[PDB]
Amino acid sequence: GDTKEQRILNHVLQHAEPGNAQSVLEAIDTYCEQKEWAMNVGDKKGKIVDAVIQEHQPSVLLELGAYCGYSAVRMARLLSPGARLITIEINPDCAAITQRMVDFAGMKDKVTLVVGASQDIIPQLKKKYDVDTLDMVFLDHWKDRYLPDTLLLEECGLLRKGTVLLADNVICPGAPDFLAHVRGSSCFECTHYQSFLEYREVVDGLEKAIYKGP
Numbered sequence: 214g215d216t217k218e219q220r221i222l223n224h225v226l227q228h229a230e231p232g233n234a235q236s237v238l239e240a241i242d243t244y245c246e247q248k249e250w251a252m253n254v255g256d257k258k259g260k261i262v263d264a265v266i267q268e269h270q271p272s273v274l275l276e277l278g279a280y281c282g283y284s285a286v287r288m289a290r291l292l293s294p295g296a297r298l299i300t301i302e303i304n305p306d307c308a309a310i311t312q313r314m315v316d317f318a319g320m321k322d323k324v325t326l327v328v329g330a331s332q333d334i335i336p337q338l339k340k341k342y343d344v345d346t347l348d349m350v351f352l353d354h355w356k357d358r359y360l361p362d363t364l365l366l367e368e369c370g371l372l373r374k375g376t377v378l379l380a381d382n383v384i385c386p387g388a389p390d391f392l393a394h395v396r397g398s399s400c401f402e403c404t405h406y407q408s409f410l411e412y413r414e415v416v417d418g419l420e421k422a423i424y425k426g427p
């Protein structure tokens with residue numbers, strides 16, 4: 214047998230162009246529109262992710278939630294030489310898929326994959342992954358972790374003035390406690406980017422929260 218995540222990977226390996234990150238993204242998006250929905254950020258919201266990366270030019274980018282590697286490929290392809298993406302994924306099989314997808318897309322030199330839970334890895338980023346502060350964070354893991362991991366990132370000293378947090382799914386499925394925190398707090402300057410849930414006409418949005426200092 215096989216799983217949805219394996220079928221998405223197999224579609225890419227068999228139909229996308231090796232070394233062509235854009236072709237990998239398009240193959241995933243086509244498979245998910247035509248065959249089986251999956252929780253990749255997708256094309257519409259992905260254009261917004263792309264725009265945030267282009268506006269901030271992060272040198273150290275952290276992703277929480279890798280899944281099959283769609284967003285890791287999408288983001289990595291816009292980073293400059295010497296920039297790096299650290300992506301944390303709790304499920305070892307998804308992590309294996311993500312590394313296979315990254316490698317196929319020609320992005321392996323940009324990406325450090327970490328297997329584990331964000332809450333376990335964040336407190337180790339400075340000591341084990343040679344992070345000082347982060348330039349940007351993409352939150353796209355289980356939504357009940359968005360608030361507590363944001364507080365962990367801050368308390369661990371990983372945010373600096375101007376660090377960008379970009380959170381998927383703030384409308385659907387929703388992340389209301391995260392939203393109330395960053396919006397209400399004087400420590401974050403927030404902008405809402407409304408769009409659509411991946412591969413659907415359901416409304417969703419992203420929140421961009423720029424840290425302003427403690």
Ligand SMILES: C[S@@+](CC[C@H](N)C(=O)[O-])C[C@H]1O[C@@H](n2cnc3c(N)ncnc32)[C@H](O)[C@@H]1O
Pocket residue numbers: 252253254255277278279280281282283284285301302303304307329330331332353354355358
């Ligand atoms: C929405 S999918 C990620 C999609 C990906 N960002 C993309 O756009 O291609 C969410 C993932 O977060 C992972 N996950 C859930 N809780 C986690 C945690 N605490 N730390 C790391 N990964 C987690 C899940 O195993 C799943 O792969």
Ligand SMILES: O=[N+]([O-])c1cc(O)c(O)c([N+](=O)[O-])c1
Pocket residue numbers: 252253254353354355356381382385386410411
């Ligand atoms: O249920 N969904 O439509 C989604 C969509 C998403 O984009 C997700 O990131 C998600 N999740 O992490 O649980 C779920």
Ligand SMILES: [Mg+2]
Pocket residue numbers: 252253254353381382
């Ligand atoms: Mg999502």
